């Protein structure tokens, strides 16, 4: 239920939260060809599940 944007201005500053999110690989899609891919995380993403 937690998202990276929840930490901004309440626990950590914005520029530091971006660095933490980008250290993870998040799945997104589908692309124009109907396939899945990975990308670094952003403030809108949820805490990654193991």
């Amino acid at each position: 239920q937690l998202h990276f944007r929840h930490l901004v201005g309440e626990v950590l500053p914005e520029k530091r939260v971006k660095q933490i999110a980008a250290e993870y690989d998040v799945t997104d899609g589908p692309n124009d060809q109907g396939e899945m891919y990975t990308r670094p995380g952003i403030l809108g993403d949820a805490f990654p599940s193991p």
Partner: protein, 74 residues
């Protein structure tokens, strides 16, 4: 006498004007109620306006709340 009867008949010739004078009297007693209802209206829509406008209607008195969060980034 016919002269007397004529003056009594004419006593109520200006009905329409007297009703207009009634309008003035009543509306003068009612119109002040616009101030209480006006204060409450502005009081309700104040927080939906931009920050820049909120500081103008109060002559710089109003300011953002200081609750200890969302401070500048180093």
């Amino acid at each position: 006498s016919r002269a007397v009867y004529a003056k009594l008949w004419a006593s109520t010739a200006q009905y329409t004007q007297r009703r207009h004078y009634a309008w003035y009297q009543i509306w003068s007693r009612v119109i002040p109620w616009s101030v209480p209802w006006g204060i409450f209206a502005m009081w309700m829509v104040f927080p939906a306006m931009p920050v820049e406008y909120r500081q103008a209607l109060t002559f710089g008195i109003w300011q953002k709340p200081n609750i200890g969060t969302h401070g500048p980034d180093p």
